[PDB]
Amino acid sequence: ADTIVAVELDTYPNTDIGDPSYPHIGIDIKSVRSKKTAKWNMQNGKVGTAHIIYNSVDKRLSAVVSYPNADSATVSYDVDLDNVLPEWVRVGLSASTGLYKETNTILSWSFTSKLKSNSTHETNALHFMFNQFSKDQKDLILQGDATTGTDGNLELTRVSSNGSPQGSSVGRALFYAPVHIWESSAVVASFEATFTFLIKSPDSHPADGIAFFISNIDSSIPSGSTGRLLGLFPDAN
Amino acid sequence: ADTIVAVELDTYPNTDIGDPSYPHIGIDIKSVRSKKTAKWNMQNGKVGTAHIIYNSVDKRLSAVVSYPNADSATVSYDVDLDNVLPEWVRVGLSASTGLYKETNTILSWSFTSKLKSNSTHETNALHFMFNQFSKDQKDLILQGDATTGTDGNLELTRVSSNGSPQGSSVGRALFYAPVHIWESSAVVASFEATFTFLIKSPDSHPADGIAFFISNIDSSIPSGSTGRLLGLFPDAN
Ligand SMILES: *[C@@H]1O[C@H](CO)[C@@H](O[C@@H]2O[C@H](CO)[C@@H](O[C@@H]3O[C@H](CO[C@H]4O[C@H](CO)[C@@H](O)[C@H](O)[C@@H]4O[C@@H]4O[C@H](CO)[C@@H](O[C@@H]5O[C@H](CO)[C@H](O)[C@H](O)[C@H]5O)[C@H](O)[C@H]4NC(C)=O)[C@@H](O)[C@H](O[C@H]4O[C@H](CO)[C@@H](O)[C@H](O)[C@@H]4O)[C@@H]3O)[C@H](O)[C@H]2NC(C)=O)[C@H](O)[C@H]1NC(C)=O
Ligand SMILES: *[C@@H]1O[C@H](CO)[C@@H](O[C@@H]2O[C@H](CO)[C@@H](O[C@@H]3O[C@H](CO[C@H]4O[C@H](CO)[C@@H](O)[C@H](O)[C@@H]4O[C@@H]4O[C@H](CO)[C@@H](O[C@@H]5O[C@H](CO)[C@H](O)[C@H](O)[C@H]5O)[C@H](O)[C@H]4NC(C)=O)[C@@H](O)[C@H](O[C@H]4O[C@H](CO)[C@@H](O)[C@H](O)[C@@H]4O)[C@@H]3O)[C@H](O)[C@H]2NC(C)=O)[C@H](O)[C@H]1NC(C)=O
Ligand SMILES: CC(=O)N[C@H]1[C@@H]2OC[C@H]3O[C@H](O[C@@H]4[C@H](O)[C@H](O[C@@H]([C@@H]1O)[C@@H](CO)O2)O[C@H](CO[C@H]1O[C@H](CO)[C@@H](O)[C@H](O)[C@@H]1O[C@@H]1O[C@H](CO)[C@@H](O)[C@H](O)[C@H]1NC(C)=O)[C@H]4O)[C@@H](O[C@@H]1O[C@H](CO)[C@@H](O)[C@H](O)[C@H]1NC(C)=O)[C@@H](O)[C@@H]3O
Ligand SMILES: [Ca+2]
Ligand SMILES: [Ca+2]
Ligand SMILES: [Zn+2]
Ligand SMILES: [Zn+2]
C-alpha cells in the first residue's frame, strides 16, 4: 500500500467507518479514520477558499475553509512530518463519489515549499498558481476519471451531463514534480495550499467530499475507490 | 533535430563556426552561430552571478554575467519568442568540453514563469531556488555524464580527479516539469534564471563553457557533443 497523508474536506458523514454525523473538515494519517474533525458548513454551489499549512517551527498541520460570508474551520492536528510521509513525494488533489452525486469543480490551486538548505540559506521552492487549468495541462498526471479544461476548471468527476456528474466516478489530480521532505535536512518546509473549489448542489444530497494529499511519488486509484475511501485509501482502515 | 534556445557562456573561441576570437557570452536560436556576443573576463574559480529574463511587453531576451567585484555583460537580443520555441518546454542546464578541461560546477539555480491567464487574472508560476543540489535530487532528469551531490553542487562533468574534470565530458540538467509558452495566450511568461556557476582554473587553458537552454519536452545528447557542439546542438550550424 502507498504511504499517504490526506486532508479531508468531507461532505458525507461516514458513521460506520468513523466520520462524525455532519459534513466535516478533517485530517488523515494513513487511514480514513481521521485524527481530528471540525464543523464545516457545506453550502450549495459557491466558491472555494481553503488553506493548508505546516510550519515545523510550530508542527501544526493547520487547515481552514471559508466560503465568503462564512466562518473558518480550524482542524489543525499535531503531527510530526518526520516519520509519516516519504523523503520525496507527489502532491495532488483527490475527489470521489459513490452512489450519491456531487460536483467537484476545482478552479484554482497553489503550493509553496520552503526547505532548509542551511536554515537561513535560501530555502528551495516549488510555488505554482494554477488559476488556468487548461484543456491539455501536462504537469498533472491526473488519474482515475478526472477531467480538465473547456473553461478554467479541473473537474475531478465524469461530468457535462448538465454537470450532474455521473455517480461512482473518481479522479485524482497529482502534480508532476516531487518535494524533498521526510526530515533529513530538517523539516521546516512550510508547504502552503489554496484550494478554490465549487460543490454544486445536485438536488441529490451532495456527498462524498474532496481531499488534499501528499502521497508517494508513485500512486494509483487504490483497489477501487468509487465512494467512501475518498479516492486514496485502499482500505477503510 | 529538437528545437532549443540557449545562452552560451562559451569558453573556447570556436574560430571556425561563428563564435568570435575571444571567449564570450552569446545567445543561440537553434544555431551555434549566435545572435549577440559580449566580451567576458574569464576569471578563475570564482562564483557565478548570471541572470536571464524575457518579458513580451519589451520582447528583448536578456542576460548578464558578473563575478562579485567584476563587471556585467548585457548580451540582450531581440528575437520573437512567438514563433521560435514550442508551447511546452523543459528548461535546464547544459555544459560540455572536449580535448580541453574546465570546471562546470553549478551550485544554485532558480526560475519564475508568469504566463498571462488573462493578463491580470493571476498567472501561473514554477518558481524554485535550487541552492542545494543534493545526492538524490529527483526532479532532475540529468542526461549525459552529469553528476550531483557529495556537497551542495551540480557537477556537469566527470569530476573528482582533484577537480581536473576529465575532458570530453558532457552533462545536461533538464528540469522535470513543463511550462506553456509559444504564444497563444500571449507570451509574457517572464522567465527568470539564476546561474551561479563555478569555473575553476584547471591550469589547462579552460575551454568550453556552460549553456542555459530551453528545449522541447523530449531530448537526448544530440549525436555526440564531446566538444564544441556545446551539449545541445546536433550540428555546428
Ligand atoms: C589532410 O587534410 C586534413 C584537413 O584538411 C588534415 O587533417 C586534420 O584536419 C583536422 C580538421 O579537424 C585538423 O585538426 C584540428 O586542428 C585545429 C588546429 O589545432 C592543431 O592543428 C594542427 C594539427 O596538427 C597543428 O597546426 C597543431 O598541432 C594544432 O594543435 C596545437 O598543437 C599544440 C602543440 O602540439 C598544442 O599545445 C598542446 O597543449 C595541450 C594542452 O594545452 C597538450 O597537453 C600538449 O601539451 C600540447 O601538444 C595546442 O593546444 C594545439 N591547439 C591549438 C589551437 O594551438 C584544432 O582547432 C582542432 O581541434 C579542435 O577540436 C575540438 C573538438 O571539440 C575542440 O574542442 C577545439 O576547438 C579543438 O581546438 C583539430 O585538432 C588538423 O589540422 C589536421 N591534422 C594535421 C595533423 O594537420 C591533414 O593534415 C591533411 N593531411 C596532409 C598530409 O596534409
Ligand atoms: C577526412 O579527410 C577529408 C579530406 O578529403 C576531410 O573530410 C571532408 O572531405 C570533403 C571532400 O574531400 C570536404 O567536405 C566539405 O565539407 C564542407 C562543409 O560545409 C560547411 O563547412 C565549410 C568549412 O570551410 C564552410 O566554409 C561552408 O560554408 C559550409 O557551411 C555551409 O553553409 C551554411 C553555413 O555557412 C550551412 O547552412 C546551415 O544549414 C542549417 C541546416 O539546418 C541551418 O538551417 C542554416 O540554414 C545554416 O546555418 C550549410 O549547411 C553548410 N553546409 C554543410 C554543413 O554541408 C563543404 O563546405 C565543402 O564544400 C566546399 O568546401 C571548401 C570551402 O569550404 C571548398 O574549397 C571546396 O572546394 C568545396 O567546394 C566540402 O563539401 C572537406 O574537405 C572535408 N570536410 C570537412 C573538413 O569538414 C577531412 O579532413 C577528414 N575528416 C572527415 C570527418 O571528413
Ligand atoms: C438494504 C438495506 O436493508 N439497507 C439497510 C442498511 O444495510 C446496508 C446498507 O447501508 C446503506 O444503506 C443506507 C442507510 O444505512 C439506511 O438504513 C439501513 C438500511 O435500510 C441500515 C441500518 O439501519 O442498514 O437506509 C438508507 C435509506 O434511507 C432511509 O433510512 C434512514 C436511516 O438511516 C432514514 O433517514 C430513513 O428511513 C430513510 O428513508 C428516506 O428518508 C426520509 C427520512 O425519514 C424518509 O421520510 C423518506 O421517505 C425516505 N426516502 C427518501 C427518498 O428520502 C440507505 O441509503 C448503503 O451504504 C451506502 O453506500 C453509499 C456508497 O458510498 C454511501 O451513501 C454510504 O457509504 C453508505 N451509506 C450508509 C452506510 O449509510 C448500502 O451499502 C446498504 O444497502
Ligand atoms: Ca467517505
Ligand atoms: Ca568553444
Ligand atoms: Zn470524513
Ligand atoms: Zn560560442
Residue numbers in the entry:
A (entry chain E), B (entry chain F): 1 to 237
Task: Give passages from the manuscript.
Processing of cryo-EM data revealed two main compositionally different groups of particles: with ConA bound and without ConA bound. The ConA-bound group of GluK2 particles includes two subgroups, with one or two ConA dimers bound. Both ConA-bound subgroups showed a distinct separation of the ATD and LBD layers, with ConA molecules serving as spacers. Notably, the ATD and LBD layers in ConA-bound structures showed a dimer-of-dimers domain arrangement, typical for closed-state GluK2 and AMPAR structures. Instead, the ATD and LBD in the A and C subunits are connected through ConA dimers acting as extension spacers. One protomer in the ConA dimer contacts the ATD, whereas the second interacts with the LBD. There were two types of ConA–LBD contacts, with the predominant type I contacts involving the A or C subunit LBD and type II contact involving the B or D subunit LBD. Despite observations of several configurations of the GluK2–ConA–Glu–BPAM complex, with one or two molecules of ConA bound and type I or type II ConA–LBD interfaces, all these configurations demonstrated a similar structure of the LBD–TMD region. Although BPAM alone acting as a glue is too weak to substantially impede the breakdown of the D1–D1 LBD interface associated with desensitization, ConA bound to the LBD D2 lobes seems to sterically hinder this breakdown further.
Kainate receptors, a subclass of ionotropic glutamate receptors, are tetrameric ligand-gated ion channels that mediate excitatory neurotransmission. Each KAR subunit has a multi-domain organization, including the amino-terminal domain (ATD), involved in receptor assembly and trafficking, the ligand-binding domain (LBD) that binds agonists, competitive antagonists and positive allosteric modulators (PAMs), the transmembrane domain (TMD), which forms an ion-conducting channel, and the carboxy-terminal domain, which determines surface expression, synaptic localization and interactions with intracellular proteins. Here we present cryo-electron microscopy structures of the kainate receptor GluK2 in the presence of the agonist glutamate and the positive allosteric modulators lectin concanavalin A and BPAM344. Concanavalin A and BPAM344 inhibit kainate receptor desensitization and prolong activation by acting as a spacer between the amino-terminal and ligand-binding domains and a stabilizer of the ligand-binding domain dimer interface, respectively.
